[PDB]
């Protein structure tokens, strides 16, 4: 469990089948997503915990650009467990540092 891996590593097995998820808000989601996640703000996890999709053998967890996601790690690992829970850095600070670009709404 709890690996806090770095970014660019993350884009390698985002791209194989890791998932995310996303314990934000989702007022968020409205312009930036993140490296393949999944809708499941802190309203969701507490009252039932991981989506049965997102329930792979190797998930993520990631909040805000640094909402400290290792404050609610120890839960956030259980909500999830058996599987493999890693975090990607300070959030969206993880996918940005490597340079790469959100889901975000295309706009000129």
Same mark, same amino acid.
């Given at each position: 469990?709890?690996?806090?891996? *770095?970014?660019?590593?993350?884009?390698?097995?985002?791209?194989r089948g890791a998932k995310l998820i996303d314990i934000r808000d989702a007022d968020e989601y409205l312009r930036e997503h993140i490296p393949?996640? +999944?809708?499941?703000?802190? *309203?969701?996890?507490?009252? *039932? $915990?991981?989506?049965a999709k997102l329930r792979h053998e190797q998930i993520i967890f990631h909040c805000q650009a640094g909402k400290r996601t290792s404050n609610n790690a120890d839960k956030l690992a259980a909500i999830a467990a058996p599987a493999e829970i890693?975090?990607?850095? +300070? $959030?969206?600070?993880?996918?940005?540092?490597?340079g790469l670009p959100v889901a975000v709404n295309k706009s000129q």
């Open positions: 469990a709890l690996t806090t891996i *770095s970014p660019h590593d993350a884009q390698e097995l985002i791209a393949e996640a +999944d809708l499941a703000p802190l *309203s969701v996890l507490e009252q *039932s $915990g991981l989506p890693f975090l990607l850095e +300070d $959030g969206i600070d993880g996918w940005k540092k490597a």
